[PDB]
CSV table of C-alpha atoms and ligand atoms in Angstrom, one decimal:
chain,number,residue,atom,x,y,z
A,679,UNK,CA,-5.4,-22.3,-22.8
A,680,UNK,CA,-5.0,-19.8,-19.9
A,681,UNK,CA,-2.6,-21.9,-18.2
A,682,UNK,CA,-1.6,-21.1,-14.4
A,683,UNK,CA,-3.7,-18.1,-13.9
A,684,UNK,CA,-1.7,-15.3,-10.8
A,685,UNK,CA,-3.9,-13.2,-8.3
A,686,UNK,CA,-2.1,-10.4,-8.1
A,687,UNK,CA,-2.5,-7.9,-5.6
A,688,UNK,CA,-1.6,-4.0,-7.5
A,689,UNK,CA,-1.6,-2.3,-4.6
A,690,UNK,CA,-0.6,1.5,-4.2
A,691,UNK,CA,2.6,1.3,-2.5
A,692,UNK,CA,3.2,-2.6,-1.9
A,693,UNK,CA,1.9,-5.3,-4.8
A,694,UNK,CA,1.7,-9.0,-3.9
A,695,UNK,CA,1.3,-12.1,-6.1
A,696,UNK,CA,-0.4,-14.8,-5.5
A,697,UNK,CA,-1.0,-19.0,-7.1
A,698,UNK,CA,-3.0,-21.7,-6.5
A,699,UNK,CA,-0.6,-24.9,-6.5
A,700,UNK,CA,-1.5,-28.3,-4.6
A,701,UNK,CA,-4.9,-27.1,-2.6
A,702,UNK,CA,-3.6,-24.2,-1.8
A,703,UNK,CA,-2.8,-20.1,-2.0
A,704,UNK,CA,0.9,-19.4,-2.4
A,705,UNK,CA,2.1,-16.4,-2.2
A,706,UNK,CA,5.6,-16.1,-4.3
A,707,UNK,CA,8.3,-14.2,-2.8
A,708,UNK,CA,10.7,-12.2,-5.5
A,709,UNK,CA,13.9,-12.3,-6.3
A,710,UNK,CA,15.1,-10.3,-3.3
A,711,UNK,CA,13.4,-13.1,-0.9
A,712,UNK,CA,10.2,-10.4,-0.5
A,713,UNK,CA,6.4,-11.4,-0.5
A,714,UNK,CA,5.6,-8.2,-0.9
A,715,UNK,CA,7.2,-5.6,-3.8
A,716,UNK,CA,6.9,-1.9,-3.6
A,717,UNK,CA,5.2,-0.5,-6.5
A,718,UNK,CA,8.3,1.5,-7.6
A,719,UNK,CA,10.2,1.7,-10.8
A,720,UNK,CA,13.5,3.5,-11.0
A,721,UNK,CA,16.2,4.5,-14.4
A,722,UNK,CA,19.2,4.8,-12.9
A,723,UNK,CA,22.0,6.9,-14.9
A,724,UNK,CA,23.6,4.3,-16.5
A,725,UNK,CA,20.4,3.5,-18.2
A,726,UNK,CA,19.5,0.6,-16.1
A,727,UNK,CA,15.5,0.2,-15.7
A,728,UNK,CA,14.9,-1.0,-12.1
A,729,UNK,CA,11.8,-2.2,-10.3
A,730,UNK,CA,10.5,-3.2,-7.0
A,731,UNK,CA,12.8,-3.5,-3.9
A,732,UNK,CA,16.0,-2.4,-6.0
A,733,UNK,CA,14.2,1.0,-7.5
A,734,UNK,CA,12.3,1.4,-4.1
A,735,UNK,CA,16.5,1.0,-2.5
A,736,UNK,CA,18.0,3.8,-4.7
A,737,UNK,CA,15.3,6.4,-4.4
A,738,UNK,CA,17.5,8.5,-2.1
A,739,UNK,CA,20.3,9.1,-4.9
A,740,UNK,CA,17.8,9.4,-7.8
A,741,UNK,CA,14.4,11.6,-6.5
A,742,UNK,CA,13.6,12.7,-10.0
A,743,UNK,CA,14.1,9.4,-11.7
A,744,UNK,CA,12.2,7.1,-8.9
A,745,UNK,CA,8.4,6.9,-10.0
A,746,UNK,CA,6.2,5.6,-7.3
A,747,UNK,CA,2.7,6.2,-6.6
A,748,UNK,CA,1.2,5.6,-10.4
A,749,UNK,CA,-2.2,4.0,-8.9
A,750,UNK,CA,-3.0,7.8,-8.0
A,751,UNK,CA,-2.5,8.6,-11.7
A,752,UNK,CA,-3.8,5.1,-13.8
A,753,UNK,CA,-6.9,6.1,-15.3
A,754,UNK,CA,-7.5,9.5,-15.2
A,755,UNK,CA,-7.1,12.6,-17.1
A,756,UNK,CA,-4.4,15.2,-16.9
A,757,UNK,CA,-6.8,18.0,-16.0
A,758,UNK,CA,-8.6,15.7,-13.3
A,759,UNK,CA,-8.6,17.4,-10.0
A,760,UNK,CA,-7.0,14.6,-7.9
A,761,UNK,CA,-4.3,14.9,-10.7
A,762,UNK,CA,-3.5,18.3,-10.1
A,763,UNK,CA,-3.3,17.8,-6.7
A,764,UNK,CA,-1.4,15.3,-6.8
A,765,UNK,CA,1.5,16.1,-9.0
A,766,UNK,CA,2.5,18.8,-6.3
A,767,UNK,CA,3.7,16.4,-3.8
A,768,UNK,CA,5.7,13.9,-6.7
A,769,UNK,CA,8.9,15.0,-7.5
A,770,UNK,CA,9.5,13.0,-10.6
A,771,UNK,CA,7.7,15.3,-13.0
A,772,UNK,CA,3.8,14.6,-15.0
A,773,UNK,CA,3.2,15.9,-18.4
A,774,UNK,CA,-0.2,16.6,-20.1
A,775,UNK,CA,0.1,14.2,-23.3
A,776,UNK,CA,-2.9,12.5,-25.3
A,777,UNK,CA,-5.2,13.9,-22.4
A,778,UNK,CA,-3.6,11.7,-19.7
A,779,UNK,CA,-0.9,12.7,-17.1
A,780,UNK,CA,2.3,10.8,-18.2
A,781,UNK,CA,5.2,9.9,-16.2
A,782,UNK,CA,8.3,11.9,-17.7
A,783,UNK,CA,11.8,10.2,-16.8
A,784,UNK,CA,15.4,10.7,-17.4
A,785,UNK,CA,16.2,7.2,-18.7
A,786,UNK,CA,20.1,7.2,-18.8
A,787,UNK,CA,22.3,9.7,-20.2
A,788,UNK,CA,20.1,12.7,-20.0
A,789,UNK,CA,17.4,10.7,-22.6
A,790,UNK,CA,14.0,11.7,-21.9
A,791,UNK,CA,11.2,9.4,-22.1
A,792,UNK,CA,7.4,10.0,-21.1
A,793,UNK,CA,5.3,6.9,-19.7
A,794,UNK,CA,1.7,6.6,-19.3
A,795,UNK,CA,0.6,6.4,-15.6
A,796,UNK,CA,-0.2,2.3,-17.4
A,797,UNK,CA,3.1,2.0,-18.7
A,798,UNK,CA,4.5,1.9,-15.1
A,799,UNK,CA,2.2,-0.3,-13.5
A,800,UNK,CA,2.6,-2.8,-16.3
A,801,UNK,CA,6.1,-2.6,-15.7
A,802,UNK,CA,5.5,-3.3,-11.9
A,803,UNK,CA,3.1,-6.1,-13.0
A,804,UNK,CA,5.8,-7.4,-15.4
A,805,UNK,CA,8.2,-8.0,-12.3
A,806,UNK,CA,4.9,-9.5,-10.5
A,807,UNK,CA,4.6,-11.7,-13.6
A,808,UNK,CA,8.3,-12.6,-13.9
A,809,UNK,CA,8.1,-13.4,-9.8
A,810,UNK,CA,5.6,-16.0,-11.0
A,811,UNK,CA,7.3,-17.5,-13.4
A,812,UNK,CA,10.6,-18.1,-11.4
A,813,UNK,CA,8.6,-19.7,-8.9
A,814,UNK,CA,6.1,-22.2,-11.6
A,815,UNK,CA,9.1,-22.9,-14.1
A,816,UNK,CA,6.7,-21.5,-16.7
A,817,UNK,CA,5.5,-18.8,-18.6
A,818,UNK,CA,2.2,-17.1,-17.1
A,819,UNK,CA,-0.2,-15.5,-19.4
A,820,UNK,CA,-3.5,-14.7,-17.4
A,821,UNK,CA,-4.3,-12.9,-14.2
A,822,UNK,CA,-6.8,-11.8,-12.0
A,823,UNK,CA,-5.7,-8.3,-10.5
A,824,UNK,CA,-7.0,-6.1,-7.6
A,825,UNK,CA,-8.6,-2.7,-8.2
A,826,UNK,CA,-9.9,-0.8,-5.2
A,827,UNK,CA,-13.9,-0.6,-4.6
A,828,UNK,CA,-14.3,3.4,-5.8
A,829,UNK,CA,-12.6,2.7,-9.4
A,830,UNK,CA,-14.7,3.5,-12.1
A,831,UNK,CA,-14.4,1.8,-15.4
A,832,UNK,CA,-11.5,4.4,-16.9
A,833,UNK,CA,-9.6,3.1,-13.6
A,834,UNK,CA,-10.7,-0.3,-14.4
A,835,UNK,CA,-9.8,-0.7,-18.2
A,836,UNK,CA,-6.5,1.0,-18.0
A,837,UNK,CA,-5.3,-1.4,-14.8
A,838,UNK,CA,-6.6,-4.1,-17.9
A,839,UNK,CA,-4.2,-2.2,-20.1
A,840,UNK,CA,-1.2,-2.6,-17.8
A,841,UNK,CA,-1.7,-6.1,-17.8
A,842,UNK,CA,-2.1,-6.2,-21.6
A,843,UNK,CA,1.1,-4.5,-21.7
A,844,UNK,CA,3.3,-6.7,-19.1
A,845,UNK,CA,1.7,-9.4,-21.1
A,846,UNK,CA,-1.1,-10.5,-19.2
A,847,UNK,CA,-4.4,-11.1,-20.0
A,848,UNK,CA,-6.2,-9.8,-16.9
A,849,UNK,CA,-9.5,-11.7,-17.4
A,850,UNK,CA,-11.0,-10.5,-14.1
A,851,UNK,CA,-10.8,-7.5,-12.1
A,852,UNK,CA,-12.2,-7.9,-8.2
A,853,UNK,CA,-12.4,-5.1,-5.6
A,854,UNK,CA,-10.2,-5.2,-3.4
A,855,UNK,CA,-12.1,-5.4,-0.1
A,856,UNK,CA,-13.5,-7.9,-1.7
A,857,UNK,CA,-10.8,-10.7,-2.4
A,858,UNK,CA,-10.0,-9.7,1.0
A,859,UNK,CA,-13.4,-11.3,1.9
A,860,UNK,CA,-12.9,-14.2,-0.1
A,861,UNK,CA,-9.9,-14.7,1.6
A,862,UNK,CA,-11.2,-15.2,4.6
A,863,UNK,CA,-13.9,-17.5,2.3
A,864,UNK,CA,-16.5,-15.2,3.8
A,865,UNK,CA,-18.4,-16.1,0.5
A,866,UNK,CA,-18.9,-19.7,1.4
A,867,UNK,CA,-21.4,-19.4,4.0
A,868,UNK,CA,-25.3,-19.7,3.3
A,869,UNK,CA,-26.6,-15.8,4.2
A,870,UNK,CA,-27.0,-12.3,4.1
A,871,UNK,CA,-24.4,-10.7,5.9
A,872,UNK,CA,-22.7,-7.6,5.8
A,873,UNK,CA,-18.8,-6.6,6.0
A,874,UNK,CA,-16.7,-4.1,7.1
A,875,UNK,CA,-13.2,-4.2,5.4
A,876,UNK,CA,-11.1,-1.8,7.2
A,877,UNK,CA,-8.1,-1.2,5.1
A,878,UNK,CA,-5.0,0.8,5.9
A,879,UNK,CA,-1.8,0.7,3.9
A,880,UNK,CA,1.2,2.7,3.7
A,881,UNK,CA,-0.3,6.0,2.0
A,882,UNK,CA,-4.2,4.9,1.8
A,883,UNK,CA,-6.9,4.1,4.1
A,884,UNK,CA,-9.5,2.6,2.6
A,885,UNK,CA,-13.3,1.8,4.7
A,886,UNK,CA,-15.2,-0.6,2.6
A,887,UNK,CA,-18.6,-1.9,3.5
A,888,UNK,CA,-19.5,-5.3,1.8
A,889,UNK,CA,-22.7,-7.0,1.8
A,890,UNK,CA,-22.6,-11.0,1.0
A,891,UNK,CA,-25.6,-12.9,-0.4
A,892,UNK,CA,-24.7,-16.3,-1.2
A,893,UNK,CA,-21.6,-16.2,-2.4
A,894,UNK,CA,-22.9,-12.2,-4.1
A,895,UNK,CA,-20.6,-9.4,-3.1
A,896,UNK,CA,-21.8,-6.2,-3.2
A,897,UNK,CA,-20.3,-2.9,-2.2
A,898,UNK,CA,-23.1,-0.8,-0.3
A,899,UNK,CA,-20.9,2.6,0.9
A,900,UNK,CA,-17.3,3.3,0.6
A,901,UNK,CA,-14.9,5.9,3.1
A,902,UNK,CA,-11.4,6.8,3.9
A,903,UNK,CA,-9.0,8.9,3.4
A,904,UNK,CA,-6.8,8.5,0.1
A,905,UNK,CA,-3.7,10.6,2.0
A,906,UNK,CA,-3.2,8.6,5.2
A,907,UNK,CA,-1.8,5.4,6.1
A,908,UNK,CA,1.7,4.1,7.7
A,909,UNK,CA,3.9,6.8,6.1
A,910,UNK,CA,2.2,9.3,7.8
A,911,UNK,CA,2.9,7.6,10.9
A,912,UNK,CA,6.5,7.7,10.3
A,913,UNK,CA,6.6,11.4,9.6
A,914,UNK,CA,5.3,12.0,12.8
A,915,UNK,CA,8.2,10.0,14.8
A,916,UNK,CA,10.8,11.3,12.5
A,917,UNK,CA,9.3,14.6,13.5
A,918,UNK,CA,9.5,13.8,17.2
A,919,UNK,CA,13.1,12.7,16.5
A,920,UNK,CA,14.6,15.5,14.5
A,921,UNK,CA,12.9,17.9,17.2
A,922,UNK,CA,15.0,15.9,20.4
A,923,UNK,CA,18.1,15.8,18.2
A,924,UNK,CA,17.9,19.8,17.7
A,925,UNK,CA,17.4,20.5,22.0
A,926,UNK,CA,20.1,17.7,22.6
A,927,UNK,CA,22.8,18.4,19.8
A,928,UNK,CA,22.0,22.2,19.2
A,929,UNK,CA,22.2,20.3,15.7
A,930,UNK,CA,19.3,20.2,12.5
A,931,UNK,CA,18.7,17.6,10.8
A,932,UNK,CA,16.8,18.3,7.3
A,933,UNK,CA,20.1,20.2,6.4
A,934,UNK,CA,21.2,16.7,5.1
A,935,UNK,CA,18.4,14.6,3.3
A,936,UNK,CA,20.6,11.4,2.8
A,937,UNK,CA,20.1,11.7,6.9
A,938,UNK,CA,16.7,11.8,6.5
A,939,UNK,CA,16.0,9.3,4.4
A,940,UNK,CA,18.2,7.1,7.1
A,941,UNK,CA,16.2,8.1,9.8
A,942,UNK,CA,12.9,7.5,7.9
A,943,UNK,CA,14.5,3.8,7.3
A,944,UNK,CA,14.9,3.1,11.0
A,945,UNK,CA,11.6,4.6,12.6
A,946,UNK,CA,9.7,2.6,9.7
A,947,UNK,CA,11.7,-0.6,11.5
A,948,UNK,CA,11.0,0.5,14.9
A,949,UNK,CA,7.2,1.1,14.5
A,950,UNK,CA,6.7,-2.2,12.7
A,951,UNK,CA,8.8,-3.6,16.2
A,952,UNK,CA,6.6,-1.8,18.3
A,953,UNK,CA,3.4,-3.7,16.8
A,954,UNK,CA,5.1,-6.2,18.7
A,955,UNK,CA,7.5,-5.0,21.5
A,956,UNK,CA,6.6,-2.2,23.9
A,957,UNK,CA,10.1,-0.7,23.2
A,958,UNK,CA,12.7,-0.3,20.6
A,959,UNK,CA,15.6,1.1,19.5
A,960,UNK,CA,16.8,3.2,16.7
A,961,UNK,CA,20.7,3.6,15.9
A,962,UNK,CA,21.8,5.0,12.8
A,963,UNK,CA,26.0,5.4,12.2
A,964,UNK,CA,27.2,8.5,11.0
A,965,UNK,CA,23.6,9.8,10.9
A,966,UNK,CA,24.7,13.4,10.6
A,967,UNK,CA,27.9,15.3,10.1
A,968,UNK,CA,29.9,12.1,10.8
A,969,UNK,CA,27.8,11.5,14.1
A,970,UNK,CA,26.0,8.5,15.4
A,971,UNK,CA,22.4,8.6,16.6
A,972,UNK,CA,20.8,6.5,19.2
A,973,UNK,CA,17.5,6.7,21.0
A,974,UNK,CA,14.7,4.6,21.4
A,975,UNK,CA,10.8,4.6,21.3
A,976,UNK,CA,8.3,3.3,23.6
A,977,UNK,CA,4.4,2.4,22.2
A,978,UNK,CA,3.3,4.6,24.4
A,979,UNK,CA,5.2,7.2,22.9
A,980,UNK,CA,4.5,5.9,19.6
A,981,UNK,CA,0.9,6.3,19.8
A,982,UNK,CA,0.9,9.5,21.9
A,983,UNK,CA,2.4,11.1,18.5
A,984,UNK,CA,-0.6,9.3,16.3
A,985,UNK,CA,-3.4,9.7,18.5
A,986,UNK,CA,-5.1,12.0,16.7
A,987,UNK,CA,-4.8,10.2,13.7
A,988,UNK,CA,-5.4,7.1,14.6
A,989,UNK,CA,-8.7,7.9,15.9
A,990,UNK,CA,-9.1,9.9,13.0
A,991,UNK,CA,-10.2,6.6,11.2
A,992,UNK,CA,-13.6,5.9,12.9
A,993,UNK,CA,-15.1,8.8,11.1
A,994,UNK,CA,-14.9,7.1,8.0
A,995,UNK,CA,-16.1,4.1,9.3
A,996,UNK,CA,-19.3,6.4,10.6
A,997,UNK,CA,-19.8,7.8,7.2
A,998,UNK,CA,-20.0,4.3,5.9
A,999,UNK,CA,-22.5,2.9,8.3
A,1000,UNK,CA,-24.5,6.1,7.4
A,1001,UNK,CA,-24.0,5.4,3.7
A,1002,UNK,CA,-25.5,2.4,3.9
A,1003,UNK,CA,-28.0,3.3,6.6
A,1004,UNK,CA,-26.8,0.1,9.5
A,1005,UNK,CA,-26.3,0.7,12.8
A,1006,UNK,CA,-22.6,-0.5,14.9
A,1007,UNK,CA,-24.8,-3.9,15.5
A,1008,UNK,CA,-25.7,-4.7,11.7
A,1009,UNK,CA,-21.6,-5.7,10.9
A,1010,UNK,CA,-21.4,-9.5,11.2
A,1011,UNK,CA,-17.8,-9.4,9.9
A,1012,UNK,CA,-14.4,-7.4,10.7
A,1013,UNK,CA,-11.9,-7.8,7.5
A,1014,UNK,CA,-8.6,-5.5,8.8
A,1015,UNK,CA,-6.4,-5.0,5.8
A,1016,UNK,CA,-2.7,-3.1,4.9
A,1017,UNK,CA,0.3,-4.0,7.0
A,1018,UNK,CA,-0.3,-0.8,9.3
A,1019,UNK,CA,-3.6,-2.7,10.7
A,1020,UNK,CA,-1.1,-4.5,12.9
A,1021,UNK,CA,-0.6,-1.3,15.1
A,1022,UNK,CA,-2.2,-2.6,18.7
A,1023,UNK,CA,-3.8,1.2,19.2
A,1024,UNK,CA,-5.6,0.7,15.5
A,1025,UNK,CA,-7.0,-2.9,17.0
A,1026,UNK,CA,-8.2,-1.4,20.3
A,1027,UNK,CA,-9.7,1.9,17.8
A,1028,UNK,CA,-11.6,-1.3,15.5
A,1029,UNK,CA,-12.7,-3.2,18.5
A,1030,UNK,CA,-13.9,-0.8,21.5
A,1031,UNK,CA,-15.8,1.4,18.4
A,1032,UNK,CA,-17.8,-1.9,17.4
A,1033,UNK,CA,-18.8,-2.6,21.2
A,1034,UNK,CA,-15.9,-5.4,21.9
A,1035,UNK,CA,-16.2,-7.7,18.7
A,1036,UNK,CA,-13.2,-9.4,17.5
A,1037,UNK,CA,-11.7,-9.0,14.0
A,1038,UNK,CA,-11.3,-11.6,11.7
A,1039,UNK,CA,-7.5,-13.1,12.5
A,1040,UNK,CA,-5.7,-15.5,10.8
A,1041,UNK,CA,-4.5,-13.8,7.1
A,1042,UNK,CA,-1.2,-12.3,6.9
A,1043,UNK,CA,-3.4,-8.5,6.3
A,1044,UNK,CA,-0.8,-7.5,3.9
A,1045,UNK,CA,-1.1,-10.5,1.9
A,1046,UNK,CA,-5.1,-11.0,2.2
A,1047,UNK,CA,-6.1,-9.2,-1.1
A,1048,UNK,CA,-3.4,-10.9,-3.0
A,1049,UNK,CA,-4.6,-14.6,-1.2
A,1050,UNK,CA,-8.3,-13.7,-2.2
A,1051,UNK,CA,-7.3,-13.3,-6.0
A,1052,UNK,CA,-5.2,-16.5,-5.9
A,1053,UNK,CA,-8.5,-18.4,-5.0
A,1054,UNK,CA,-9.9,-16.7,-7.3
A,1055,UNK,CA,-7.2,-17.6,-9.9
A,1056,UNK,CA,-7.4,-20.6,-9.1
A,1057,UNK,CA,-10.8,-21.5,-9.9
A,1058,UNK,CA,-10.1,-19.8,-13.1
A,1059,UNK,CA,-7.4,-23.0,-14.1
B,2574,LIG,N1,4.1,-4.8,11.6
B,2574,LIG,C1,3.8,-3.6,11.2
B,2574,LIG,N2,3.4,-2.7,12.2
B,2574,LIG,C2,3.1,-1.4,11.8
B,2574,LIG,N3,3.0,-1.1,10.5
B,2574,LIG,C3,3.4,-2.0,9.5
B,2574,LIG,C4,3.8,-3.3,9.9
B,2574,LIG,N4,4.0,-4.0,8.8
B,2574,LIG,C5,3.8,-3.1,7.7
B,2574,LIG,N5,4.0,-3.4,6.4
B,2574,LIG,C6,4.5,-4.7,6.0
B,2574,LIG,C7,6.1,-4.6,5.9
B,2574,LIG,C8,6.6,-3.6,5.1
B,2574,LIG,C9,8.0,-3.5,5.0
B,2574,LIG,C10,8.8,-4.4,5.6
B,2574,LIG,C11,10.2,-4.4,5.5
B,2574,LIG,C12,11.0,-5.3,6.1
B,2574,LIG,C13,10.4,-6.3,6.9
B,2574,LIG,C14,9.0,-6.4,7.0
B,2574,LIG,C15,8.2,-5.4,6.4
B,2574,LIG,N6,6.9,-5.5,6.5
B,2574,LIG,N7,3.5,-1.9,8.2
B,2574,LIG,C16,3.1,-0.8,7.5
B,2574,LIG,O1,2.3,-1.2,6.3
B,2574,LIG,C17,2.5,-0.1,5.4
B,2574,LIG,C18,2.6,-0.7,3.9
B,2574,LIG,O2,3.5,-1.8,3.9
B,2574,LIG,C19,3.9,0.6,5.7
B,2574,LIG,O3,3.7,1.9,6.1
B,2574,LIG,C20,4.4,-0.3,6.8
B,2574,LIG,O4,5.1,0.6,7.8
């Protein structure tokens, strides 16, 4: 009846689908040849409803019209005190209607149309769902999706409710941390043993800590910080970067945004180098006023300008192991999670504050939650 069930991964920035197919996960690229799709839904002028990699392409030319970031939103009430702090740094504009804070867009033409915080994310689900389907050479009808470990069942039911809209019949909902876990198949030991899921993605870091009893997850304690993850990281090189243009070129920089949002492109591409290479370079043509830019990077640069926030994300992991009263040698598992838990400083943070233990390794850590719901998924056909 339910057919090839998807794991999919509804993450804040960057959503991943998963499939169980021969014995194994697989994680379906889109249409764009991308594993990963941003969360990001665009109406461009013409009337032309974009999502994923194409709306997340245009956003530069169409601020106001480029809704991102709903997974802040889904699930709570307009006058809801993350709300209201929130809407002050979106620049596509939230309405109070039917008590909820709803998306309001120009869809072509100067039309206006409002959408519920669910109404986006089922759309984003929708081009998870038709990723699927391009891949299986079916129609998909069930899911299992990913909510993080501190939603609470508002959260919960209307994630269910973008699904139900897309067209999917979400018949589970896991933590995140969790699939994660299952993942790595940390569920298929005999045991009591207790996780620490260390997750940091492009605008959230999320500290989870698990306990497993027999293949029974359970989340003990949760930390983080809901504002920090690999954007902020960018900022602060594109900071450094606008600052040596000025003493070099006499010249500023924020005085043209579509150079900005160029710059922002290729520090993004050199920090995700520099997980990797001790050095890179960044060269933009016709970066401003006709002019071509050209410097480069070094790690230790790179993390000089992030020190303080990398280590900034052992306090959390302090607040959890209080939370759930353990001490550094109760953790019997490392789960690192979110693309920006590549950065080599972030490893050596993980590491040297656990004594020298070793992360789990092996799980593409953008693609782990998504994996862990495929399993999951997979069980379910
Ligand atoms: N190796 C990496 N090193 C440091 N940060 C990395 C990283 N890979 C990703 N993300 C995966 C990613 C994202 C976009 C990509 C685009 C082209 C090619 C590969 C890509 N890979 N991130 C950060 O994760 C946050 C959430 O994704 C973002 O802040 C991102 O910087």
């Amino acid at each position: 009846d339910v057919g090839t069930v998807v794991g999919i991964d509804l993450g804040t920035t960057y959503s991943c689908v998963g499939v169980f197919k021969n014995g194994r996960v697989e994680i379906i690229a889109n249409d764009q040849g991308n594993r990963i799709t941003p969360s990001y839904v665009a109406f461009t002028p013409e009337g032309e409803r974009l999502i994923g990699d194409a709306a997340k392409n245009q956003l530069t030319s169409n601020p106001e019209n480029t809704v991102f970031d709903a997974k802040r939103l889904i699930g709570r009430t307009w006058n809801d005190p993350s709300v209201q702090q929130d809407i002050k740094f979106l620049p596509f504009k939230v309405v109070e209607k039917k008590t909820k804070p709803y998306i309001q867009v120009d869809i072509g033409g100067g039309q206006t149309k409002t959408f519920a915080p669910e109404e986006i994310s089922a759309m984003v689900l929708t081009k998870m769902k038709e990723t699927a389907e391009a891949y299986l050479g079916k129609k998909v009808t069930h899911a299992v999706v990913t909510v993080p470990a501190y939603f609470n069942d508002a959260q919960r039911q209307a994630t269910k409710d973008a699904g139900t809209i897309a067209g999917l019949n979400v018949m589970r909902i896991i933590n995140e941390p969790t699939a994660a876990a299952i993942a790595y198949g940390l569920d298929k030991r005999e045991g009591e043993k207790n996780i620490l899921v260390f997750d940091l993605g492009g605008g959230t870091f999320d500290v989870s800590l698990l306990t497993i009893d027999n293949g029974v997850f359970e989340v003990v304690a949760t930390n983080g910080d809901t504002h920090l993850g690999g954007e902020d990281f960018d900022q602060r090189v594109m900071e450094h970067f606008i600052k040596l243009y000025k003493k070099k070129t006499g010249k500023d920089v924020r005085k043209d945004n579509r150079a900005v949002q160029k710059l922002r492109r290729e520090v993004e591409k050199a920090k995700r180098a520099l997980s990797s290479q001790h050095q890179a370079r960044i060269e933009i043509e016709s970066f401003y006023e006709g002019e071509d830019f050209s410097e480069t990077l070094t790690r230790a640069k790179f993390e000089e300008l992030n020190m303080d926030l990398f280590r900034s994300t052992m306090k959390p992991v302090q607040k959890v192991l209080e939370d759930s009263d353990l001490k550094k040698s109760d953790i019997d598992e490392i789960v690192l999670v979110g693309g920006s838990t590549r950065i080599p400083k972030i490893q050596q943070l993980v590491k040297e504050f656990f004594n020298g233990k070793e992360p789990s390794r092996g799980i593409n850590p953008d693609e782990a939650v998504a994996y862990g719901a495929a399993v999951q998924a997979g069980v379910l056909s």
